[PDB]
Ligand binder design. Structure first.
Ligand SMILES: O=C(O)C[C@H](NC(=O)c1ncnc2[nH]ccc12)c1ccccc1Cl
Length: 167
């Protein structure tokens, strides 16, 4: 039993809610919140900009040190950093950004990172300003992640569309 509330059950292990992931994180303090990162960990907009703002830019400061030491992530890759005031850990996951011309095929690899964590609070990877088809991303999610994932979808119309079209 865990402390996620008001989530609609999609599958054995995937639940979904129309909610602001920052507010969910501040409420639940999950072990892991997922960030929809880019390879440089430059947290400008979308999930990343929103999470980082909620940490008072501490996420960005930590991320800049990570990149200075380790170099960029791979598209499809991830790293574990602090969750600051939002969670114990933040799993920064790089899905493909279709608006950068990146290979949507790498979305499955991106979701595989979730399997290294028993429970996660997460956004829908590559959705929104990452420009992928969100129905497709939800399918790849449910068909790839085997651990317990709680998805927070910001946009109400998007949430309604995702629920109504889910197979
Ligand atoms: O779930 C959505 O609608 C799409 C989602 N965006 C957010 O979660 C989000 N965006 C902007 N400001 C925000 N403030 C609090 C949450 C938040 C998203 C997921 C992956 C990649 C990019 C994007 Cl854009």
């Amino acid at each position: 039993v865990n402390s996620f509330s008001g989530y609609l059950k999609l599958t054995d292990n995937v639940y979904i809610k129309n909610a602001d992931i920052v507010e969910e994180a501040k409420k639940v303090k999950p072990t892991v919140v997922v960030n929809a990162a880019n390879v440089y960990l430059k947290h400008g907009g979308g999930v990343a900009g929103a999470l980082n703002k909620a940490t008072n830019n501490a996420m960005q400061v930590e991320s800049d040190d990570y990149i200075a030491t380790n170099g960029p992530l791979k598209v499809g890759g991830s790293c574990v950093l602090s969750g600051h005031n939002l969670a114990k850990h933040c799993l920064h996951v790089v899905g493909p950004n279709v608006n950068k011309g990146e290979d949507i095929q790498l979305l499955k690899s991106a979701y595989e990172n979730f399997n290294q964590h028993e429970v996660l609070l997460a956004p829908l990877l590559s959705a929104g300003i990452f420009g992928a088809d969100p129905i497709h991303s939800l399918r790849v999610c449910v068909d790839t992640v085997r651990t317990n994932v709680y998805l927070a979808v910001f946009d109400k119309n998007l949430y309604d569309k995702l629920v109504s079209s889910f197979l």
